[PDB]
């Protein structure tokens, strides 16, 4: 018997086996299942997401709502569920840790290389839980679609390799990432920035911005046109400035590739990321 | 799609067509049937193939792959395998290239737990990582619902049961009885490469272990101790372990499993039994 599922309204199920019972049901009757992995306290940038999968004809959105052990936390599941259901999700997936993780951590993914790299340094076991904790909500619910934002660009990266390597059938979609009114990219983390962090922190989408338009002039002038913006900022502490291709393997000569950086203001450590065209 | 016709034998190559093909399938009704092999098919690996086959509606599908990870010299038989299964009544074959498995060499792989560090692994503790890495792609490209494995690889087996459960597979997993020859070894590929001598001494194993699951009405130590005189009173076998864990190859007066790794020569054999420690 298939859990109780009622159309145009948000459903929250905190259980695995329910979700995945009424995500199966309602793809036999011709739905398309869309998957939106979130850790709660929703804002604009989570909603892009939810956004994209709306869009697509005949879906029904699912959005995860689940903070992960493995990869100082604030919630606010009733706000979370008023922002979906005024968005018109009809499914919310809100499991526990134990529900998830019920032997413990036994058997885990364990990604490539790059998950050493980049934010894979301050955070060497991060992408570990990453990988693990998506790979077991794609065989819960079984999306059509997979929704990540493009803020978290490694992130992203690494699902396309999970989902290419053990050959799962889900379309990833990458969703841009969605900025305050000056550039800087929405974070739960911007609250914190007092005002002259705040002010300071524009600089690295300022430096990424002026980096994708300096590049008509090649790689290094993108490079340096980024550090110039940053060295302009007092309390921006680099932690990294690379550019990359678009897989995040080493830059070609020329063609696309990805500029990213993470900075800390004091104790609030900031990413941001841009495509780039080299020449 | 690819073609697919029902009541012969289907070889598929591409990961993408047995994908299709198995998904077409299942909109159909039937159930897919998954028996993950690495060839040179005996009495064994087709007594799987008999269990998926009288699944009601079952599509049997067998996977023929060696997989370069979980070693670190195998035995190819391809025709005579295709053969077997024709005369199985199996319909779908999948032989994937190395190339279309591994087109990105190793990347993402899966880390089993701790098990995998002990037994078979003690020796090789990569090799389980290789087996549910491979084992999840082929359970990803063909989705089926029921997976089978021997209780012969009896870790193996329960780490496919973690695997499943940890990563909320949808698949059941069906353990398939240790198909024997006439005086109790334990069918294996791995026999052939045993003389007539080794051969002779090899039932040591099984008789071992049937001698321990009998002798277990008087305890766990009694039933380790007839095992172990067994061993001891057999010809050039070398033991490697000879250990009873729980069913799920934790620790230990309940009911467990007996398992053996021993070498004959350069052939190393496995065996294992159920146990019942005071239950006649
Ligand atoms: C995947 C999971 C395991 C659940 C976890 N590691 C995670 O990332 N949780 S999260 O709550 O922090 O983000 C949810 C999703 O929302 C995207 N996102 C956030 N800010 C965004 C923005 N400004 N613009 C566009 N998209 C944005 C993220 O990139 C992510 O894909
Ligand atoms: C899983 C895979 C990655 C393909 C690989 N590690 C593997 O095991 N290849 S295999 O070709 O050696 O065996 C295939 C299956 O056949 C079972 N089996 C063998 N001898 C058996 C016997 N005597 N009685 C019952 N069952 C038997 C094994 O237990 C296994 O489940």
Do not use: C, W
């Not at 660009?153 to 690494?158: A, E, K, P, R, S």
């Not at 830059?251 to 203001?265: D, Q």
């Amino acid at each position: 018997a298939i859990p109780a599922f009622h159309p145009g309204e948000l459903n929250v199920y905190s259980a695995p086996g329910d979700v995945a019972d009424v995500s199966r049901a309602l793809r036999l009757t011709g739905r398309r299942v869309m998957l939106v992995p979130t850790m709660g306290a929703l804002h604009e940038g989570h909603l892009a997401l939810v956004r994209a999968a709306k869009r697509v004809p005949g879906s029904v959105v699912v959005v995860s709502i689940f903070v992960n052990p493995m990869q100082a936390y604030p919630r606010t599941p009733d706000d979370d569920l008023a922002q979906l259901r005024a968005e018109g999700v009809e499914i919310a997936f809100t499991p526990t840790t134990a529900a998830m993780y019920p032997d413990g951590l036994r058997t885990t993914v364990q990604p490539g290389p790059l998950a050493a790299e980049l934010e894979g340094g301050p955070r060497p076991t991060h992408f570990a839980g990453v990988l693990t904790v998506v790979l077991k909500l794609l065989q819960i619910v079984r999306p059509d679609r997979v929704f990540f934002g493009e803020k978290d660009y490694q992130q992203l990266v690494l699902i396309r390799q999970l989902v290419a390597d053990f050959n799962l059938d889900v379309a990833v979609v990458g969703v841009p990432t969605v900025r305050e009114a000056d550039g800087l990219a929405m974070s739960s983390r911007n609250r914190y920035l007092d005002p002259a962090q705040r002010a300071a922190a524009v600089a690295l989408s300022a430096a990424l911005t002026a980096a994708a338009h300096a590049a008509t002039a090649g790689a290094q002038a993108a490079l340096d046109a980024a550090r110039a913006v940053l060295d302009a900022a007092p309390g921006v502490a680099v932690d990294y400035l690379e550019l990359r291709d678009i897989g995040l393997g080493p830059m070609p000569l020329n063609g696309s590739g990805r500029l990213l950086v993470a900075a800390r203001l004091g104790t609030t450590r900031l990413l941001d990321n841009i495509a780039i065209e080299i020449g």
